[PDB]
Design a protein around this nucleic acid. Sequence first.
DNA 1: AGCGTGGGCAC
DNA 2: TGTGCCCACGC
Length: 85
Amino acid sequence: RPYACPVESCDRRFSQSGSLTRHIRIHTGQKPFQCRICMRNFSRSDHLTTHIRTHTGEKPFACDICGRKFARSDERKRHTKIHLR
DNA sequence: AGCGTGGGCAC
DNA sequence: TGTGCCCACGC
Ligand SMILES: [Zn+2]
Ligand SMILES: [Zn+2]
Ligand SMILES: [Zn+2]
């Protein structure tokens, strides 16, 4: 509720100053972080990190039940539930 | 499946 | 003033 977004259409607010200014990038279209492999620009450093794994094939997250690996923790999370029948 | 991408947040 | 996870959607 403290920090807020000045643009007309939006009615959003952020507790941390950083999240307000991160959101503002949606409006300005700023994409600060670039992939030195395919040159594609991204809005967030964390999304650039996971994107790079699509190129390298790095998959740090293994399923506890079957061991299948994933580049992202949420992909693994989405996967694990399939072992429930 | 593969994976873009914003919000909540701890640090 | 960032960095970097977890979470959630969406397609
Ligand atoms: Zn806004
Ligand atoms: Zn790339
Ligand atoms: Zn599995």
